[PDB]
Amino acid sequence: SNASKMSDVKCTSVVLLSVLQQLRVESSSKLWAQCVQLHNDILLAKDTTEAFEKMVSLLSVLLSMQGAVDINKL
Amino acid sequence: NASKMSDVKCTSVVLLSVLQQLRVESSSKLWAQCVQLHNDILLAKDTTEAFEKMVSLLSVLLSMQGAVDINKL
Amino acid sequence: DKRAKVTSAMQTMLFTMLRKLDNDALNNIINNARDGCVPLNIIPLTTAAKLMVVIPDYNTYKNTCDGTTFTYASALWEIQQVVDADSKIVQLSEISMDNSPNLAWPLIVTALRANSAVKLQ
Amino acid sequence: KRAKVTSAMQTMLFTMLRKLDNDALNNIINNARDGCVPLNIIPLTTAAKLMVVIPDYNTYKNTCDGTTFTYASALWEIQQVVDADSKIVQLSEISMDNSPNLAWPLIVTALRAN
């Protein structure tokens, strides 16, 4: 049950990083390094609480990019 | 189903990232084939098509003896 | 543009996975983003750390703010400053149903993650 | 620390793969755990050619019967077998008593059946 979500949230973080990469965030050197570190922290998370809180930060990077993604997927 | 669809597509993104970390981009022809497989998985409309392409994509990783430990296998 | 089709499918799968996780904080910030309330810096996790958020309209202001408290990402945040779209300070008393058409939307709220434990230590 | 990240990403990959619970993926993962691994991309079309490493007799007998090779939820028609020295091996040679005399691993070439 909880181990199910653990792998699910880790899989999700890889997609999130890939979506951010496809949005040319790698050109923002400092921001991209912060995204990679958060993704790394999620993959290395010990419990679902820590993984979810780090995902909050990682996802907020995507959500700040208005017009890059649509509200129709939100 | 619709969740099985999202899980398989999520898995294929992870598989490609695992292969990228294993330097498969340095084989331009093979990397082009992996990307096309991943693309077709992400664009699939049914689970059967998505799983058949995943077999091909996964076989790239499994072909690389000494790149993934037997523990995870 | 196959790359664009794939990008669209990858983004749609991402939010399908996110909803399937059913985390209250993730749901909150996605649901806020759908209404135009989006963060401007990375959402921080340590107490007293600074968050800046866009508030697009009065309806969203009332749905997230009460007094000096902003509710977001399953946490409470103490509002320090509000500025309008020309970067001019806005007092909370100005944000009323009657006065909001007079304001330059969207507003930008700066707030600090609230802490409940031994506040005077 | 990139090795820890890389190891975590690969553990999660195979945990997700197992969660998909697909027979064909399960079959090739389990075969790979025993050392039976492909040498080209597994094809999906009738009569397409596949090459696999077969490490030992127990794996050979686990996957091969007559001239049929079972793999990735499909049947494959064995076309040719070679040993480590790239010398052709007849199926009649791959036997419990004679396998100690072969140069393992073998490489089996087969064509997908429809």
Numbering used by the authors:
A (entry chain A): -2 to 71
B (entry chain C): -1 to 71
C (entry chain B): 78 to 198
D (entry chain D): 79 to 192
From the reporting publication:
In SARS-CoV-2, besides RdRp (Nsp12), the RTC involves nonstructural proteins Nsp7, Nsp8, and others. Nsp12 is the largest component of the complex, and Nsp7 and Nsp8 are considered cofactors.
The other structures were obtained from crystallization in the presence of protease Glu-C (V8). The C-terminus of the Nsp8 is well defined in Nsp7/8B, but not in other forms. In all of our crystal forms, the heterodimer formed between Nsp7 and 8 places Nsp7 near the half β-barrel-like domain of Nsp8 with the N-terminal helix of Nsp8 extended and pointing away (approximate dimensions of 40 × 40 × 46 Å). The similarity between all heterodimers in all our crystal forms is remarkable, with a root mean square deviation of 0.82 Å for 184 aligned Cα atoms despite different unit cell dimensions, different space groups, and different asymmetric units. In contrast to previously reported Nsp7/8 structures from other coronaviruses, in all three of our structures, either as in the asymmetric content or symmetry related, a heterotetramer or a dimer of heterodimers is present as an elongated, thick rod shape of 40 × 92 Å. The differing crystal forms show only slight variation in the packing of Nsp7/8 heterodimers to form heterotetramers. The heterotetramers are formed between the two heterodimers that are related by the noncrystallographic twofold rotational symmetry.
